[PDB]
């Protein structure tokens, strides 16, 4: 059935690492197996949008993706360590082997030089009814920091009737790198002008969540079981079956609040059989839960909430009412929320949450603070400056990322 594709683009290290878990999943969910291109079994559902971010060949199933890096590690690690060359094949691959050495600026300029090889693949082998993009990076590093800036950048201004969605990684708050604040800033004030919308993950959250209900490749191999179920309502049909720009319009009340907060429930199989159905949707509205490192509840602007597997009006209302929506929304309206037939192949149930809170104006302050505690003492920005990113440049940068934290405070309230 011909409609509705999607181009995924890894971008870095960490976004490549992701796309393991995250096609394992999304494979698995379409009753297709990852190491050998085929269906899993005969049984098959009558109605199916594989098509959305699957590619059918004579030979068997491939991902719609490009695999971009500046390095071959990332690359190396889905086609050595996991064995699926077959799958994350060469002709997807757009590799360089000089290093973003975890700057912004050098993942921006080089990645420039691979540009117009990325822009001919897509005009030479996407179809014409692709929707948009998936752009899949962290924010921390270099090149997918820089790079996955520029194409974000890139691909909006190509293509201006395709969305151009986007799934960063933020860094850690107390463990991570010194770059990273600069890399952060820099990335988030790119995304906020030429993202259609952004749903953050950060690795300070997925952290806690993992020890509190209780081997890096254990941590990108979370990020994508929930990067695969935030899609969950673009490749399954049901009451909020949406494409990528409906996805957007249901959260992005004004053009600058694009930055998403996602929640899901379960994560791991000893919570699915301990917890029933309203102990996921509480928990997908528990801060604790989300998947950026929140301290309190927040005010929500525009949320979408979708049940999966065997559920079966009472889940809303007690919910709707405990939940803190910004000033000047609807009672009737801020949330929606609808069952999704199809499950997770781990669990037989699950509960996902995308909210557009105010909240992320807390979670954007702490990045500034650290941006700050480093730049005001002109600390780690000789490299930067170096590769075409003026102290100017940071600063400028720096602003415009305050003025998005204050929208966010003004709608607050
Ligand atoms: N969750 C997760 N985060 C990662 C992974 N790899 C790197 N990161 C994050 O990304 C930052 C490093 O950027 P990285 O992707 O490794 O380098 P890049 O090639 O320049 O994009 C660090 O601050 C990490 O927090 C991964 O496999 N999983
Ligand atoms: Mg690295």
Same mark, same amino acid.
């Given at each position: 059935?011909?409609? &509705?594709?999607?181009?995924?683009?890894?971008?870095?290290?960490?976004?490549?690492?992701?796309?393991?878990?995250?096609?394992?999943?999304?494979?698995?969910?379409?009753?297709? /197996?990852?190491?050998?291109?085929?269906?899993?079994?005969?049984?098959?559902?009558?109605?199916?949008?594989?098509?959305?971010?699957?590619?059918?060949?004579?030979?068997?199933?491939?991902?719609?993706?490009?695999?971009?890096?500046?390095?071959?590690?990332?690359?190396?690690?889905?086609?050595?360590?996991?064995?699926?060359?077959?799958?994350?094949?060469?002709?997807?691959?757009?590799?360089?082997?000089?290093?973003?050495?975890?700057?912004?600026?050098?993942?921006?300029?080089?990645?420039?030089?691979?540009?117009?090889?990325?822009?001919?693949?897509? &005009?030479?082998?996407?179809?014409?009814?692709?929707?948009?993009?998936?752009?899949?990076?962290?924010?921390?590093?270099?090149?997918?920091?820089?790079?996955?800036?520029?194409?974000?950048?890139?691909?909006?201004?190509?293509?201006?009737?395709?969305?151009?969605?986007?799934?960063?990684?933020?860094?850690?708050?107390?463990?991570?790198?010194?770059?990273?604040?600069?890399?952060?800033?820099?990335?988030?004030?790119?995304?906020?002008?030429?993202?259609?919308?952004?749903?953050?993950?950060?690795?300070?959250? !997925?952290?806690?969540?993992? *020890?509190?209900?209780?081997?890096?490749?254990?941590?990108?191999?979370?990020? +994508?079981?929930?990067?695969?179920?935030?899609?969950?309502?673009?490749?399954?049909? +049901?009451?909020?079956?949406?494409?990528?720009?409906?996805?957007?319009?249901?959260?992005?009340?004004?053009?600058?609040?694009?930055?998403?907060?996602?929640?899901?429930?379960?994560?791991?199989?000893?919570?699915?059989?301990?917890?029933?159905?309203?102990?996921?949707?509480?928990?997908?509205?528990?801060?604790?839960?989300?998947?950026?490192?929140?301290? +309190?509840?927040?005010?929500?602007?525009?949320?979408?909430?979708?049940? &999966?597997?065997?559920?079966?009006?009472?889940?809303?209302?007690?919910?709707?009412?405990?939940?803190?929506?910004?000033?000047?929304?609807?009672?009737?309206?801020?949330? *929606?929320?609808?069952?999704?037939?199809?499950?997770?192949?781990?669990?037989? *149930?699950?509960?996902?949450?995308?909210?557009?809170?105010?909240?992320?104006?807390?979670?954007?302050?702490?990045? !500034?603070? &650290?941006? /700050?505690?480093?730049?005001?003492?002109?600390?780690?920005?000789?490299?930067?400056?170096?590769?075409?990113?003026?102290?100017?440049?940071?600063?400028?940068?720096?602003?415009?990322?305050?003025?998005?934290?204050?929208?966010? *405070?003004?709608?607050?309230?």
């Amino acid at each position: 059935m011909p409609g &509705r594709e999607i181009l995924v683009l890894h971008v870095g290290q960490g976004g490549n690492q992701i796309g393991y878990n995250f096609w394992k999943t999304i494979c698995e969910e379409h009753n297709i /197996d990852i190491r050998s291109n085929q269906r899993k079994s005969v049984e098959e559902d009558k109605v199916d949008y594989k098509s959305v971010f699957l590619v059918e060949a004579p030979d068997g199933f491939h991902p719609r993706a490009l695999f971009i890096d500046l390095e071959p590690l990332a690359v190396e690690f889905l086609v050595k360590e996991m064995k699926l060359g077959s799958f994350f094949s060469e002709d997807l691959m757009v590799l360089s082997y000089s290093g973003a050495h975890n700057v912004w600026s050098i993942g921006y300029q080089t990645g420039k030089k691979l540009i117009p090889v990325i822009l001919e693949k897509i &005009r030479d082998t996407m179809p014409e009814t692709l929707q948009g993009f998936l752009i899949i990076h962290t924010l921390g590093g270099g090149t997918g920091s820089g790079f996955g800036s520029l194409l974000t950048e890139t691909l909006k201004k190509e293509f201006p009737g395709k969305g151009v969605l986007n799934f960063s990684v933020l860094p850690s708050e107390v463990n991570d790198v010194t770059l990273a604040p600069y890399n952060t800033v820099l990335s988030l004030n790119h995304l906020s002008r030429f993202s259609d919308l952004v749903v953050l993950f950060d690795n300070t959250a !997925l952290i806690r969540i993992v *020890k509190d209900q209780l081997q890096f490749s254990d941590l990108n191999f979370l990020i +994508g079981r929930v990067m695969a179920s935030i899609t969950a309502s673009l490749r399954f049909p +049901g009451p909020l079956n949406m494409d990528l720009m409906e996805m957007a319009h249901n959260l992005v009340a004004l053009p600058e609040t694009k930055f998403i907060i996602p929640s899901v429930a379960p994560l791991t199989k000893e919570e699915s059989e301990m917890s029933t159905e309203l102990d996921l949707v509480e928990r997908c509205f528990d801060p604790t839960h989300y998947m950026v490192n929140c301290s +309190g509840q927040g005010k929500t602007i525009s949320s979408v909430l979708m049940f &999966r597997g065997n559920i079966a009006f009472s889940i809303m209302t007690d919910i709707k009412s405990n939940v803190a929506f910004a000033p000047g929304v609807h009672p009737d309206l801020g949330l *929606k929320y609808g069952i999704c037939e199809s499950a997770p192949v781990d669990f037989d *149930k699950e509960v996902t949450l995308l909210s557009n809170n105010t909240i992320i104006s807390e979670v954007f302050n702490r990045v !500034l603070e &650290r941006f /700050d505690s480093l730049f005001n003492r002109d600390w780690y920005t000789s490299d930067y400056v170096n590769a075409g990113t003026s102290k100017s440049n940071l600063k400028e940068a720096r602003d415009n990322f305050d003025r998005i934290i204050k929208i966010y *405070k003004e709608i607050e309230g």
